[PDB]
Design a protein around this motif. Structure first.
Motif, short mmCIF file in Angstrom:
data_model
loop_
_atom_site.label_atom_id
_atom_site.label_comp_id
_atom_site.label_asym_id
_atom_site.label_seq_id
_atom_site.Cartn_x
_atom_site.Cartn_y
_atom_site.Cartn_z
N UNK B 6 0.60 -1.22 0.22
CA UNK B 6 -0.07 -0.18 -0.26
C UNK B 6 1.19 0.84 -0.21
N UNK B 7 2.17 1.10 0.38
CA UNK B 7 2.90 2.49 0.65
C UNK B 7 3.80 2.22 -0.84
N UNK B 8 5.32 1.47 -0.79
CA UNK B 8 5.95 0.96 -1.61
C UNK B 8 5.36 0.73 -3.38
N UNK B 9 4.41 0.98 -3.35
CA UNK B 9 3.70 0.77 -4.85
C UNK B 9 3.63 2.20 -5.54
N UNK B 10 3.43 3.40 -4.11
CA UNK B 10 3.23 4.70 -4.85
C UNK B 10 4.27 5.05 -5.20
N UNK B 11 5.64 5.32 -4.26
CA UNK B 11 6.67 5.60 -5.28
C UNK B 11 6.90 4.86 -5.83
N UNK B 12 6.38 3.91 -6.58
CA UNK B 12 6.69 3.15 -8.32
C UNK B 12 5.65 4.04 -8.50
N UNK B 13 4.37 4.70 -8.31
CA UNK B 13 3.72 5.01 -9.15
C UNK B 13 4.60 6.36 -8.96
N UNK B 14 4.97 6.85 -8.42
CA UNK B 14 5.75 8.53 -8.58
C UNK B 14 6.97 8.24 -9.78
N UNK B 15 7.90 6.99 -9.49
CA UNK B 15 9.05 7.28 -10.56
C UNK B 15 8.36 7.42 -11.75
N UNK B 16 7.42 6.35 -12.57
CA UNK B 16 7.38 6.58 -13.26
C UNK B 16 6.88 8.15 -13.92
N UNK B 17 6.19 8.82 -13.02
CA UNK B 17 5.79 9.79 -13.30
C UNK B 17 7.18 10.32 -13.56
N UNK B 18 8.85 10.89 -12.60
CA UNK B 18 9.73 10.96 -13.27
C UNK B 18 10.37 10.63 -14.30
N UNK B 19 10.49 8.99 -14.80
CA UNK B 19 10.93 8.64 -15.45
C UNK B 19 10.33 9.52 -17.05
N UNK B 20 8.96 9.45 -17.42
CA UNK B 20 8.90 9.81 -18.99
C UNK B 20 8.73 11.21 -18.62
N UNK B 21 8.98 12.62 -18.35
CA UNK B 21 9.39 12.87 -18.12
C UNK B 21 10.43 13.77 -18.26
N UNK B 22 11.66 12.81 -17.67
CA UNK B 22 13.22 13.69 -17.56
C UNK B 22 13.69 12.23 -18.78
N UNK B 23 12.48 11.49 -19.18
CA UNK B 23 12.76 10.56 -20.64
C UNK B 23 12.16 11.52 -22.57
#
Lengths: 132, 37, 75
Positions: B6-23
């Protein structure tokens, strides 16, 4: 179809030169904003720049959205109005047009039958005799 | 360890946003060079 | 039907449906404004309309809004 003054706002011009000169030797192209009137005072307000691949003799607009993403970003302030024309630059060669210029200009006129081109020549444009 | 996912999925949802941005900012420059090449 | 705007701010509206071929669509502005589509650039919300992914995969509903753009070249 004569006697057509073209007033320009001084905030418009010096932006036309600066970006019109910083890219020297390679030429450069942007846009004009303003508004037609009945026939005579086709004024001008403000300008801006499309991204582009500039040479000493040739250039196009690479991206086809930075002019569209920005007007829609401008009206939040509405500091200007719609589009009226487009300029370009011949850096040391004189003030005229070419067979490429007309082919693109020929689109604007049939699109809108008073749009205008503008030509500038900053190198020989000394503190006196501008040649725009 | 139920609260983990319930928590460590939240960060995964974040870094995908961090990745596609820098991508994309690199894709932006990646095209610029070709325009000026 | 559909709406189409311009960089001038002018509007043109076309009579079409979800079956539309960009090679056929590009001829429509040529029907009215007299533009070869080589000098064309249509937009839907930052997504340039690629001529391949025809509008069926673009959610072109009724009364939708587009933006036309002319090409720019000089020398």
């Amino acid at each position: 179809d004569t006697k057509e003054t073209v007033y320009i706002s001084s905030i418009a011009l010096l932006k036309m030169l600066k970006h019109g000169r910083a890219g020297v030797p390679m030429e450069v192209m942007g846009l004009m904003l303003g508004e037609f009137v009945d026939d005579y005072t086709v004024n001008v307000v403000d300008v801006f720049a499309m991204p582009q691949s500039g040479t000493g003799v040739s250039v196009e607009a690479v991206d086809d959205v930075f002019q569209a993403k920005m007007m829609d970003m401008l009206k939040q302030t509405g500091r200007d109005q719609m589009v009226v024309g487009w300029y370009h630059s011949h850096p040391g060669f004189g003030c005229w047009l070419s067979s490429v210029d007309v082919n693109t200009q020929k689109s604007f006129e049939q699109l809108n039958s008073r749009a205008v081109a503008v030509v500038v020549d900053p190198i020989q444009s000394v503190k006196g005799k501008v040649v725009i | 360890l139920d609260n983990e996912i319930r928590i460590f999925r939240s960060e995964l949802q974040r870094l995908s946003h961090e990745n596609n941005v820098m991508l994309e900012k690199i894709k932006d420059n990646k095209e610029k060079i070709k325009n000026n090449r | 039907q559909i709406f189409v705007k311009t960089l001038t701010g002018k509007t043109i509206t076309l009579e079409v449906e979800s079956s539309d071929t960009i090679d056929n669509v590009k001829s429509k502005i040529q029907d009215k404004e007299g533009i070869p589509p080589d000098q064309q650039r249509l937009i839907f919300a930052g997504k340039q309309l690629e001529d391949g992914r025809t509008l069926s995969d673009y959610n072109i509903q009724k009364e939708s809004t587009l933006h036309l753009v002319l090409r720019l070249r000089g020398g």
